[PDB]
Amino acid sequence: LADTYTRVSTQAMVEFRYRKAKLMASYSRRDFVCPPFNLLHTVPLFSWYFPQGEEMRQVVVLQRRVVDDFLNSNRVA
Amino acid sequence: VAQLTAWEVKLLDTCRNKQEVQAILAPTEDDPSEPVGYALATFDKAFLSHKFVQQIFTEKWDTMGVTDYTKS
Amino acid sequence: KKPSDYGCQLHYKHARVKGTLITAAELGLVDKYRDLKRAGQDILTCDWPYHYSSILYACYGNQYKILQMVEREFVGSTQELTAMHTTRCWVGKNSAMVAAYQGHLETMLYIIDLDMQGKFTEDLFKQRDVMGKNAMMWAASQGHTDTIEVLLVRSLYRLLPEDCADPLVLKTRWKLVSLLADLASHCRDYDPGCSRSFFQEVLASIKYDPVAVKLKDVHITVRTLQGVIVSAYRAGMNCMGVIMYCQSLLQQARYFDDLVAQLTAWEVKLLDTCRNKQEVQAILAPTEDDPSEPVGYALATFDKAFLSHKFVQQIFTEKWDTMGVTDYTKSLFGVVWGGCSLVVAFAAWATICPLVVVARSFLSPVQDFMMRGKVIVDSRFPWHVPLYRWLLTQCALITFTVLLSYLVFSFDPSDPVPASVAPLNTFLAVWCAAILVDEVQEYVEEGRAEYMSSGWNVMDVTMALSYILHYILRIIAVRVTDNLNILLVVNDLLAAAALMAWFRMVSVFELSSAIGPLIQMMKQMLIKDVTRFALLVLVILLGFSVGMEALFQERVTGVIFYLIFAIVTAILLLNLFIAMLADTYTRVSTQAMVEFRYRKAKLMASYSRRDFVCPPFNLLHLVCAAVGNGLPVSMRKNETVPLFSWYFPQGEEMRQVVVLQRRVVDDFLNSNRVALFREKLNAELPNLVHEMLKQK
Amino acid sequence: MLIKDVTRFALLVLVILLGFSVGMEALFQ
Amino acid sequence: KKPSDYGCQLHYKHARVVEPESTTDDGMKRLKDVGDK
Amino acid sequence: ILRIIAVRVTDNLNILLVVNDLLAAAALMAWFRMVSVFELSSAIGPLIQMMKQ
Amino acid sequence: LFREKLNAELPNLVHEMLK
Amino acid sequence: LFREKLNAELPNLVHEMLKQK
Amino acid sequence: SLLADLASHCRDYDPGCSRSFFQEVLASIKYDPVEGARQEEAAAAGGGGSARE
Amino acid sequence: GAALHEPTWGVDDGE
Ligand SMILES: CCCCCCCCCCCCCCCC(=O)OC[C@@H](COP(=O)(O)O[C@@H]1[C@H](O)[C@H](O)[C@@H](OP(=O)(O)O)[C@H](OP(=O)(O)O)[C@H]1O)OC(=O)CCCCCCCCCCCCCCC
Ligand SMILES: CCCCCCCC(=O)OC[C@H](COP(=O)(O)O[C@@H]1[C@H](O)[C@H](O)[C@@H](OP(=O)(O)O)[C@H](OP(=O)(O)O)[C@H]1O)OC(=O)CCCCCCC
């Protein structure tokens, strides 16, 4: 009773939100149909993966606005 | 471990919008190192349950609010 | 060249490498849309299965460039554009809902841009759809945090007035509109070669000429919310309202819990900046200049850090009690004498209250005498003590639980035909009509959300149904004058009204801390942890009840090894249920003095507006309130009297309150200016400790 | 627990069991 | 132009009846409940 | 498979008493699998993860 | 007591050594 | 332990550094 | 150098020239730690611009 | 050593 209450109170949404994220990414890589129509007969995970041209030029500016304020934050903390 | 875990949630909280979440989590052509796919491969829970990473999955997975026409 | 220990662990694994102005606007061809229009078409062409206009497609696919090209020759008056942007959708959207339906910064900056011009005659972002969402409730439900911040800057811009002329209110209006023009900063028009960035006329009409980009330069941090709270106060506003309004935006944004919990601790910080009762009622006062009550707002957005403060709890105490009658309980003399006067005055109430109901509604000066009260609360005029309105609606509540329990205790099917129309059963039916009429006029008077939030407003209706549909099924189904049928439901619904009767009696401990914060605790782990666990048990219990049938359809090692799987799974579930109530106990026992004081202040205000009558007299006064107009108040004295007496002050007491709040708020805004100055120094110590170890 | 946990609970269990007893009494008649 | 985006969120909803001379002090306020005798 | 062997040699305690036992395990694992509809729903999702841990 | 006035007020002491 | 000799001495060290200054 | 301190001995197997433990990895790094500190503690006295923030 | 006196610097000088 008090070994699940240690886990229900602390990490229960975190165990839920992680399983929800492993379910929404099992379908971004999945092929075609379910057990019905299965015996009757390298894609990227995200559409914002690998920006090519001007979208790459904005992201590499954008990550030096976030990381260089995070490393500047841990240096003071 | 419990400092590096509390540094990868502290970086995710530094991002203020959605474009700054997929700017650090995206593999470019220079460094093709995706950290999202490494979080699914090592069962990272303190990263994958954050509210800015739970959003970027829900925009690829739903993208029409079909799960939002329920609280009516 | 082989990849490193870091390389082949983290790197990317796989080796990568019509017309009709419907698909003309969805794709983004600007020239094709103009040529098909010049031949002749409809700019509001409606596709069937989703009512999407041609204008509304351009907001959908982020090609705003069509919507600027529509502005050149295809709109006349500024009313015609609003007919074309707010057309409809099939789910209820307009142009600024579909562009915030998915994150479309380049288009939602455009519809915001036309709104700050005034090109629309309507508040285009304040409209609602058929679902009930907003233009900003859609950007927060999906989570598009990039266009939430564009919506939040507009809502923080409409707050600050256009009419005022002040350097501190004109600096942080050009500071907000530059934060959207810098946020666009690109994406020029359909026609190349035109001086039009995205925001020119809104930066022009602002009266402000100023004389390595970080992350705090392009976002709404605490530094720009303090710059709005002080600068809505310069233009002349309720500083307790602008804090309560800016927090109601950022709670709707759903992704700023760094600024909600900073603004929540700015309204508790402001409240105890006051010293006495004269200074609390100054800053909470809706005077004639800014008639904005933030007490009445905060018990409409359920502001528990405000409503449970030790100062707001004493501006309600001086109205509803102000005699210490609630503390004639923790003593030896107070209970036996104050409780003795309770049963006397309740007997004095029931034998005088229908007499003063009919005398109030007819032409007599005793309606002047019943108004002689309610400006001082004491025992000289006990009918306008809001505690003595609460004691009589509970003493009438206890009577209904006794008199209905007395009905089932003296009951048998051996009674004659004169038992359906009885001196007891018929009186308990006009009570349940007086309950249901009360719950109707507590639904439309307060609202839908302010009524279905208590948790007992279901049990008022339910026992007023299962006794009305018991007295009806006593004259429709039982032997008075009718036929014979299966009548178990007639005697079943009586306990369905009797169970909820004594459960309704627990509302008499809605005061009394340490008996109070258990009933909320009991009604927290029953609405969210009982209907939730019994669904997951039900889909598991159907597995065993069907899995039982598959065994015995065609031995002890088959069933006892089946049973040990059921005793384990029942223990493994009861292990999870007890840890689900001991979890919910810990969530509500820590806030036991905030969840109680908030729930106390929602009935020190609900009973302070309402009358001294009608737990049964909503069929005895409502029948004479319509007659008194036919031959004069029904429920309009709750709304005319403004909840207090230190409200709208005429004369030279307003000349002291506005003097008094400028020594509370101005002695608060130079305290946030000192606490935030340390945060400018908090993230600077490796540049200050390096100087003091160089000067030394 | 006889000082602090009885007089605040046994008044509140009593209002429940009287409701269930009356709700049983109209189901046994 | 009238309900400026928080006017119909925060301003006092009902229409009050302006009394001619109503003192809101601690004394000389309760003159309609107690006598002047 | 084992139900078409039920037309063969009659044992009826060695062969037929395990046929119904597999079908209960066929269905008991199937409605436990019906819990997997609530994987996305908040307030039932944490109930499945705590029943898993 | 001076530890609860050097904890929450340490940035205001390393400011008057600069001036 | 040398810091504990300095730990219970700060209202005699902070008074000196705010006098030398 | 955190490992060359963790060895600090192992005069390997012979009177060979003391081979500290990593004498051909520290010498393959192009770093002198008396020239690195001086252009860091002085560039950090200008507020910033030493390496990055 | 000044049984209720303690050295104070100043909390002011914000914006
Ligand atoms: C409670 C409102 C939804 C109930 C109506 C659902 C009935 C079945 C609809 C079947 C049509 C499927 C169309 C939608 C497809 C789909 O994705 O369904 C998934 C879902 C349904 O849709 P969903 O994603 O909207 O379901 C959840 C749910 O509504 C939560 O109550 C919200 O949390 P909340 O209580 O804090 O508001 C979540 O919001 P969030 O996402 O932010 O975490 C939301 O995801 O899959 C299901 O079919 C499960 C059936 C849902 C019934 C749950 C009964 C729970 C009763 C007790 C809870 C109330 C007390 C709250 C406790 C905190
Ligand atoms: C019977 C007493 C004489 C009548 C006077 C009626 C006055 C009245 O109704 O008070 C509630 C009463 C007293 O309970 P109780 O002894 O625990 O006293 C309450 C509590 O102990 C705290 O002292 C106060 O809360 P807080 O720490 O200061 O926050 C609270 O006042 P408030 O601050 O919360 O307001 C006190 O009332 O609760 C009952 O159980 C009797 C129900 C019978 C109700 C009447 C019959 C329906």
Residue numbers in the entry:
A (entry chain D): 743 to 783, 813 to 848
B (entry chain D): 372 to 443
C (entry chain C): 17 to 33, 53 to 246, 324 to 666, 717 to 793, 805 to 869
D (entry chain B): 637 to 665
E (entry chain B): 17 to 53
F (entry chain D): 584 to 636
G (entry chain B): 849 to 867
H (entry chain A): 849 to 869
What did the study's authors say about this model?
Transient receptor potential (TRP) channels are ubiquitous cation-selective sensory ion channels that respond to numerous physical and chemical stimuli and are often considered polymodal signal integrators. In this study, we present cryo-electron microscopy (cryo-EM) structures of crTRP1. The crTRP1 architecture is unique; it exhibits overall C2 symmetry and its ankyrin repeat domain (ARD) appears to bend towards and interact with the lipid bilayer. In agreement with a previous study, we found that crTRP1 requires both heat and the lipid PIP2 for its activation.
We heterologously expressed the full-length crTRP1 in HEK 293S cells and purified it in the detergent glycol-diosgenin (GDN) or lauryl maltose neopentyl glycol (LMNG). The final reconstruction of crTRP1 in GDN exhibited an overall resolution of 3.53 Å, with higher resolution for the molecule’s core. For crTRP1 in GDN, the density for the P-loops was completely invisible, presumably due to their higher flexibility, while for crTRP1 in nanodisc, the purported helical portions of the P-loops were poorly resolved and modeled as poly-alanine helices. Regardless of its symmetry, the crTRP1 ion conduction pathway is occluded in both the GDN and nanodisc structures, as evidenced by a strong density in the middle of the ion channel pore. The hydrophobic environment at this narrow, gate-forming region of the pore suggests that the density may belong to a lipid. We identified twelve (three per subunit) well-resolved, non-protein densities in the crTRP1 cryo-EM map that are buried in the inter-subunit intramembrane interfaces. On the basis of the shapes of the putative lipid densities and the proximity of their apparent head domains to positively charged residues, we have modeled the site 1 and 2 densities as PIP2. The head of the site 3 putative lipid, which we modeled as phosphatidylcholine (PC), is surrounded by seven tyrosines, two from the pre-S1 elbow and five from the ARD fingers. Unlike structures of the majority of mammalian TRP channels, the rose-shaped structure of the crTRP1 homotetramer has twofold, rather than fourfold rotational symmetry. While deviation from the fourfold symmetry at the coiled coil region is accommodated by a simple swing of the coiled coil helices in subunits A/C relative to subunits B/D, the pore-forming S6 helices in B/D undergo one helical turn (~100°) rotation with respect to the S6 helices in A/C, exposing a different set of residues to the pore.
